[PDB]
Design a protein around this ligand. Sequence first.
Ligand SMILES: Nc1ncnc2c1ncn2[C@@H]1O[C@H](COP(=O)(O)OP(=O)(O)OP(=O)(O)O)[C@@H](O)[C@H]1O
Length: 319
Amino acid sequence: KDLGIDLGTANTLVYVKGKGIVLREPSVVAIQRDTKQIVAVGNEAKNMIGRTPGNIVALRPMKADYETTATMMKYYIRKAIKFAGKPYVMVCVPYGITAVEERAVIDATRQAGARDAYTIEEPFAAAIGANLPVWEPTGSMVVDIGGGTTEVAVISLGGIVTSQSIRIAGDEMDEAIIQYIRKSYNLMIGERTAEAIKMEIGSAGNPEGIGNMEIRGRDLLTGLPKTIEISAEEVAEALRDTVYAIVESVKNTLEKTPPELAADIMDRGIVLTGGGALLRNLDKVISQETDMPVIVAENPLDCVAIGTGKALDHIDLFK
Ligand SMILES: Nc1ncnc2c1ncn2[C@@H]1O[C@H](COP(=O)(O)OP(=O)(O)OP(=O)(O)O)[C@@H](O)[C@H]1O
């Protein structure tokens, strides 16, 4: 029974042909500090972390190493198959991926127990998962904003016409908030607080009425913890350059798009997928700066994984 696997920078999802998303686990491993060997993956790692056995540290590999990939894929595949035979595995990969890296991904999935492994670029999977008409001779456009990358693509006739990837996404919005608070308040906050600010009062623009938030961090003069209040308006300033860079990759992908496909997209709209697509008003801001309709996909966190699974029905194209 064939599997689609989305090993995301923070979240891993496994799709099983005929069952849907059957596995939702963090992209994390636990490694024994001294032996440097992986001893748990995903939920087994997170729970081992909560048992606290010492001599063990958690890592986020997808934030790269062939054996880590193989070990993680072996866990997720074995965990997902609740067994009819060695599976055929569709592996979602970032659009940037090079040939040597793509073959390293296939070989490690084979090592993990796949009969054979195929890859699908993330924007293509997201477009399939967002129900864009990717097989028709008309233009479609998806912007997938994850934790590590923003991937923009124009799809037509079952393939990517043009596509761009930038390393400016969810994690970079967090960093922009950290850096803004550092410069403005001489206060250093951690990544957990930055993430919460982004989710609770973050916006791409027009932050009126979103509200304010009390946050805590380290005063950089005294080194002592300090509490301040930050506003939606400030957070939107903090995120301005990140948002501008996403807008610019959408524009730059359009400028590389043939004219008729560009016309189809202006008519049907751009679809935003991924967790970063939930930044408040990002759809409106991309719409305003490009003069195009922009909508956030239904089920934006699962589009990629569902698209990876639906690609199993078209295994011939990826073989
Ligand atoms: N409400 C929200 N507002 C803004 N960002 C959010 C929200 N919810 C989640 N995110 C962001 O979504 C990102 C993770 O999204 P997603 O699960 O699609 O990524 P991923 O698949 O793990 O990563 P990648 O696609 O880069 O491999 C994180 O940066 C997270 O902060």
